Amino acid sequence: RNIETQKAILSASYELLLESGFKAVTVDKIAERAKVSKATIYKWWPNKAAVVMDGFLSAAAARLPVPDTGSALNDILIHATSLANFLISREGTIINELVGEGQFDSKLAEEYRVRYFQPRRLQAKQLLEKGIKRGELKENLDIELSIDLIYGPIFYRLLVTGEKLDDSYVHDLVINAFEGIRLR
Amino acid sequence: RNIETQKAILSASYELLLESGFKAVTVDKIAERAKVSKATIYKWWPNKAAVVMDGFLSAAAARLPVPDTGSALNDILIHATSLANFLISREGTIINELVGEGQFDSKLAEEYRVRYFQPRRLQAKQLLEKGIKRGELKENLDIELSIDLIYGPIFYRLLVTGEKLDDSYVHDLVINAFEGIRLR
């Protein structure tokens, strides 16, 4: 109901996150910075991961535009490139850190799976489902696996390999996920 | 030269890693546990990440067998499944933790990239190069990108999604990376 209160709590959580890192954030510290009580915070968020996640999503331009180019390929290309561009952004670099912490904190992982990753994957599903009903995609396509083929390499590059995640790489990745490695 | 000394240092580093986690390991602690001097350790390893990485690789069955089924598909299937099976193993679960820490410690990331990930990717390259000279793969195949299509989804599942990484998933993943999502 109170948008100013919600804003203060969310700004405080993100400020603390950037200043000190995830592990050091506590609900008490957020309450202190936001000048609200813990009970108020617990009106809207049960735990520190939930509030920090909403703080991040509030502060960053994480919501991707929805292409409708009439082409599954060119739709996914724009989607994946816009995702990759977010991830390399200063704001997007928080994702590394959160996923890193999430290897040790399943509460945080639950939060990013439902609040960050699910909505973006949903968008990708919507573009693929256009392609299916357009009759341009595989017979009995496994949508979720197909999204794994595009997203997987993206996040693998971001988290593991440390290689350059640029438009040209993402272009090649999308095409090759569409063509497959088998000779045609 | 001294295999017993090397063994003691490597066992100590892995013991400390399992007991206390990566961040708490120090070269001093390894020296203490192994009953050797820091100077001895620094005969073979400059830093804690290097020694902990070799400790891990020494203790775990991380070296994958090399299929030669005369089929790029069935070769990669066996490779990727054996990798996935390692990753879900008790020993393999250390990879999550190391990559997690590696988001904050580039020294560790350098170590796992060259000592763990590179050799496995090399093996995958060798299987794909058989397929290319067999004339069963794509015209002008980008080998490294192709490995990204298989490995990426694997590590994405392991690190981000928390979904079940089983033989059947890996099977579907490999086939779909071979077929592509575009209608044939």
Instruction: Provide CATH 1.10.10.60 ranges for chain B.
Output: 1-47
- Phi and psi angles of residue B137, each rounded to the nearest 5 degrees, phi first: -105, 175
For residue A156, the one-letter residue type is Y
The sign one gets for the Cα dihedral B149, B165, A107, A105 is negative
Chain B's closest residue to A154, CA to CA, is: B152
The CATH number given to A48-184 is 1.10.357.10
Chain B 65-104, residues with CB within 8 Å of chain A CB atoms: 73, 96-97, 99-104
Cα(A103)–Cα(B158) distance, integer angstroms: 10
Reading the block at residue B26, the tokens are 């120090």
Quick one: which H or E segment has residue B69? Answer: none
Provide, as residue numbers in chain B, all residues whose Cβ is less than 8 Å from the Cβ of A152. 149, 152-157
3-state SS, residue A137:
strand
CA distance B137 to B131: 6
CA–CA gap between residue B50 and residue B66 (Å, rounded): 26
Q: Is B80 within 8 Å of A140 (Cβ atoms)?
A: no
Task: List the structure tokens of B78.
Answer: 């066996």
Could you give the angle at the alpha carbon of A25 between the alpha carbons of A24 and A30, nearest 5°?
145
Percentages helix, strand, coil for chain A (3-state, rounded to 5) are 70, 0, 30
For residues A93 and B1, what is the distance between their CA atoms, to the nearest angstrom?
Answer: 44
B149 CB neighbour count, 10 Å cutoff: 26
Segment (H or E) for A89: none
Q: How far apart are CA A76 and CA A84, in angstroms?
A: 12
The two tokens of residue A173 are 């990745």
Three-point CA angle B175, A157, A103, nearest 5°: 95
Closest approach of A167 to chain B, Cα-based (Å): 14
Token reading at B128? 């794909």
What's the token pair of residue B89? 């193993």
Q: In whole angstroms, give the CA distance from residue A163 to residue A152.
A: 14
| Shortest CA gap B6–chain A (Å) | 28
> Which of chain A's residues have a Cβ under 8 Å away from the Cβ of B100?
99-104
* C-beta atoms surrounding B30 within 10 Å: 27
Helix axes B94-102, B48-59, angle to 10 degrees: 160
Task: Give the separation between CA B31 and CA B38, rounded to whole angstroms.
Answer: 6
- The answer to whether B177 and B149 are in contact (CB under 8 A) is yes
Contacts with B138 from chain A: Cβ below 8 Å: 179-184
User: Helix B48-59 to helix B27-34 angle, to the nearest 10 degrees?
Assistant: 50
Q: What is the CA radius of gyration of chain A?
A: 19
Cα distance from B143 to chain A (closest Cα, Å)? 9
- Which amino acid is residue A48, in one-letter code? K
Q: How far is CA B174 from the centre of its chain?
A: 18
One DSSP character per residue, B129-147 reads HHHHHTT-B-TT--HHHHH
Query: Can you list the pairs that B140-147 forms with residues at least 24 positions away whose Cβ atoms lie under 8 Å?
Result: B141/A181, B142/A172, B142/A176, B145/A153, B145/A172, B145/A173, B145/A176, B146/A176, B146/A181, B146/B177, B147/B121
CATH of domain A1-47: 1.10.10.60
Closest-CA distance, A109 to chain B, in angstroms, reads: 8
Residue A110 corresponds to which tokens in the numbers above? 């639950």
Other residues' Cβ atoms within 10 Å of the Cβ of residue B7 = 12
A142 Cβ under 8 Å from any chain B Cβ: yes
Residues of chain B with CATH 1.10.357.10: 48-184
Contact B65, B82 (CB under 8 A): yes
For A144-182, the three-class secondary structure string (H helix, E strand, C coil) is HHHHHHHHHHHHHHHHHHCCCCCHHHHHHHHHHHHHCCE
Quick one: angle between helices A3-20 and A48-59, nearest 10?
100
Q: Do B149 and A177 touch (CB under 8 A)?
A: yes
Phi, psi of A137 (to 5 degrees): -105, 175
Task: Judge: A145–B173 Cβ closer than 8 Å, yes or no.
Answer: yes
- For chain B, the distance separating the N- and C-terminal CA atoms, rounded to the nearest angstrom, is 57
Record the tokens describing residue B138, joined without a space.
């794509």
Coil vs helix vs strand at B137: strand
Helices B143-156 and B72-88 pack at an angle, to 10 degrees, of 30
Residue B58 has which token pair?
């020494």
Residues in chain B closer than 8 A to A92 (CB atoms)? none
Structural tokens at position A53: 């996640």
Query: How far are the Cα atoms of A154, A156, A157, B116, B145 from residue A163, in angstroms, in the given order?
Result: 10, 10, 6, 16, 12
Buried b (16+ CB within 10 A) or exposed e, B158-180: bbbbeeebeeebbeebbbbbbbb
Breaks (C-N over 2.5 A) in chain B follow: none
d(CA B122, CA B128): 10
- Rounded CA gap, A176 and B143, in Å? 11
Task: State the structure-solving technique.
Answer: X-ray
